[PDB]
Amino acid sequence: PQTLSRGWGDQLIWTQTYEEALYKSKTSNKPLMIIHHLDECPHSQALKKVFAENKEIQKLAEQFVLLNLVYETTDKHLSPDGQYVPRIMFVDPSLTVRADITGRYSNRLYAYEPADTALLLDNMKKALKLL
Amino acid sequence: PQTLSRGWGDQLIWTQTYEEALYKSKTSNKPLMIIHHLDECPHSQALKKVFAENKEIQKLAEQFVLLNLVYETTDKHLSPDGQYVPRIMFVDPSLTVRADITGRYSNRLYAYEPADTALLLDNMKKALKLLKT
Amino acid sequence: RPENLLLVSTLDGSLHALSKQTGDLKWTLRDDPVIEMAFLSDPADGSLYILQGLMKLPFTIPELVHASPCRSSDGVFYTGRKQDAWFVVDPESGETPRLYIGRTQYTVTMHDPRAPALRWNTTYRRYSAPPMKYMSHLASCGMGLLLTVDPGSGTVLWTQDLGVPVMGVYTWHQDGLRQLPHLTLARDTLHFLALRWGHIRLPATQLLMTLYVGKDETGFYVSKALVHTGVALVPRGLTLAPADGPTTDEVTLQVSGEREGSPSTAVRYPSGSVALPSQWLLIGHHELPPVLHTTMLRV
């Protein structure tokens, strides 16, 4: 009944906790993608729909360590300019947060709309280029 | 496909992260139960089967904040005598770890076995009696 | 009569008796100061702070005393003792119907098993008073200004200066001490509200919660003081980037959440300068520190 995917894609392997996600990213050399969202946020719901119904994003998501959280993480580096949802952040396998990978908007550096799927794909491809 | 409960109980409401579980236990004033287990350990699987099939435990678990983990958390307080599995540890909504609540083994103070249904149920009931402040 | 008095507890432990209607300064009492890596304590609610920058402990001083001896996830051990005092005060002359003022003195000694001899102390004194439309009592953070506006409408009646800041307003109700609610405002905020609107209407203009850091003769002390847009906050540790892009409003604000003492990851910022570590301990108003992710283990 209760699923790790939370509607962001079911054929994908998701990590439960941040620490195990970091361990997986370090061991397997796969970049970690973190999606912050809320179940009572219509913006998160629409972005969830677009993310789940995008073939290319689902295909590229298998090259990552995936993690979606409904609550704020304990890491201070994951919210450089505020705590809001929906918010997608990237972490290099070097355990270095890729805060330089940002979206298209200035007030919310890491917020994605249900139209910036090409931008999300570009940012994921950029994140795959390891430091 | 993959679920938050991992087979311990599917009709129960489980938490995903330790910090969110702590926040929920603080706001809702409900004791937090953490189950540390591994998919490989046969003892973990046996205890999972017994825990899932126990109706008394299932009915009582709805008054708790639930959390089962397969990877050890950074908090050393949840490993007072080691990192063996399975462990069941209880946290008072005052953010105090109830290390008084123990199993039946001195060496493994929090490891339960499938024959310890009643002991685990009594430990949960004891955890329901919140500490004073 | 005791009912007409309004005892005001300040930072240095003094107890200033005032008339409720007029606010004139009656007798005053002299007692010990309210409060005495580093630990900064809020002298109003007993909260404790970790000086990673600055953070807030999830346990106040009385909780640590009641749970002592204990240890946290960081490894710091906590010891605590409590001691009361029951001096009797004449309502008229203010010497030590009679006034029964009880004070509880809390002390928490923190020692870390890592550093063998280095340790820290703290003290926090709480008056024995239960917590009892518009807020009637407002206290300035930096200065000792006390405002009393009408709960019925919201018009000021009397202002008084006491010197050191005010950390509690008490009244003698039934036959004991009772703590009236109060709000901490920046003096500039109170002045702005007085000149612009003319009637204070604080619920019981944007008012922002800031954590004022003050320094006195007993050490550093924090306080939760509201400010208006116009009060200069001390700059934060990070200035991210002067990015110029389209603005989006389709986000939802999310709770802060707890934060870990020692970081687990590094960070790389986009062409953005990083400054000093948030420069706490500066006289001024800071953004609200995050509460620290930790638990307790009674030994």
UniProtKB/Swiss-Prot annotation, chain A:
One Gene Ontology cellular component term attached to this UniProt record is: extracellular space
Motif extent (Homodimer stabilization): 5-14, 20-27
Please give the Gene Ontology molecular function terms for this protein. dystroglycan binding; epidermal growth factor receptor binding; identical protein binding
Q: What is its main location?
A: secreted
The reported effect of residue 20 to A is: Monomer only, and reduced cell adhesion efficiency
Question: Could you state one GO biological process linked to this protein?
Answer: positive regulation of gene expression
Name the consequence of residue 103 to E.
In RIFTD; uncertain significance
Alphabetical keyword list: Disease variant, Disulfide bond, Endoplasmic reticulum, Proto-oncogene, Secreted, Signal
Q: In which tissues is it expressed?
A: Expressed strongly in trachea, lung, stomach, colon, prostate and small intestine. Expressed weakly in pituitary gland, salivary gland, mammary gland, bladder, appendix, ovary, fetal lung, uterus, pancreas, kidney, fetal kidney, testis, placenta, thyroid gland and in estrogen receptor (ER)-positive breast cancer cell lines.
Keyword Cytoplasm recorded? no
Q: Where in the cell is it found?
A: Secreted; Endoplasmic reticulum
**Record note on what altering residue 77 to Y does:** In RIFTD; decreased interaction with MUC2
Protein's job: Required for MUC2 post-transcriptional synthesis and secretion. May play a role in the production of mucus by intestinal cells. Proto-oncogene that may play a role in cell migration, cell differentiation and cell growth. Promotes cell adhesion.
Assembly and binders: Monomer and homodimer. Interacts with LYPD3 and DAG1 (alphaDAG1). Interacts with MUC2; disulfide-linked.
The entry's family comment says: Belongs to the AGR family.
Q: Which disease is it linked to?
A: Respiratory infections, recurrent, and failure to thrive with or without diarrhea: An autosomal recessive disorder characterized by neonatal onset of recurrent pulmonary infections, coughing, wheezy episodes, interstitial lung disease, and bronchiectasis. Episodes of vomiting and chronic diarrhea result in failure to thrive. Results of sweat chloride and pancreatic elastase tests are normal.
What is the designated name of this protein?
Anterior gradient protein 2 homolog
What broad taxonomic lineage does this protein's source fall under? Eukaryota, Metazoa, Chordata, Craniata, Vertebrata
Q: Which part of the complete sequence is present? A: 41 to 171 of 175
Swiss-Prot record, chain C:
What the protein does? Induces translational repression through 28S ribosomal RNA cleavage in response to ER stress. Pro-apoptotic. Appears to play no role in the unfolded-protein response, unlike closely related proteins.
Q: What is this protein identified as? A: Serine/threonine-protein kinase/endoribonuclease IRE2
A single GO molecular function, which one? endonuclease activity
Major subcellular location class:
endoplasmic reticulum
Q: Which residues lie on this side of the membrane: Lumenal?
A: 1-299
Please tell me one Gene Ontology term that the record gives under cellular component. endoplasmic reticulum
Entry's family note: Belongs to the protein kinase superfamily. Ser/Thr protein kinase family.
Organism whose genome encodes this protein: Homo sapiens
Any single biological process term in GO: protein phosphorylation
Does Nucleotide-binding appear among the keywords? yes
